[PDB]
Homo-oligomer: 31 residues x 4
Amino acid sequence: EYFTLQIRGRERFEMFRELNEALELKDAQAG
Amino acid sequence: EYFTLQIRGRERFEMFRELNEALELKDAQAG
Amino acid sequence: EYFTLQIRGRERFEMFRELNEALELKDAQAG
Amino acid sequence: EYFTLQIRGRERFEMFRELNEALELKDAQAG
């Protein structure tokens, strides 16, 4: 299930995007 | 400028939503 | 109960510090 | 340079620990 979050500010968006990509990379390997 | 981030998983979405709301509350007061 | 997390990199530390302060401000008011 | 952040609450600590480990895994590979 996918959800969408609206974020205000380019810098804030960049931060959350990096954190989300980091979590997805962790899962793809698992650990 | 608003951006939208697609997140996978209800629990992950809840976490990012709380973090985003926390940052917005901090800004509304400023500090 | 307090815990301590060791973080590598000033920029990363700044980011987590802002996020942690944001969550604490949210709790102090509650919502 | 390593920094230390004091966090209140086991659940909050768990969340930041997962996020920090995710960022470190991303860097170890780079991307």
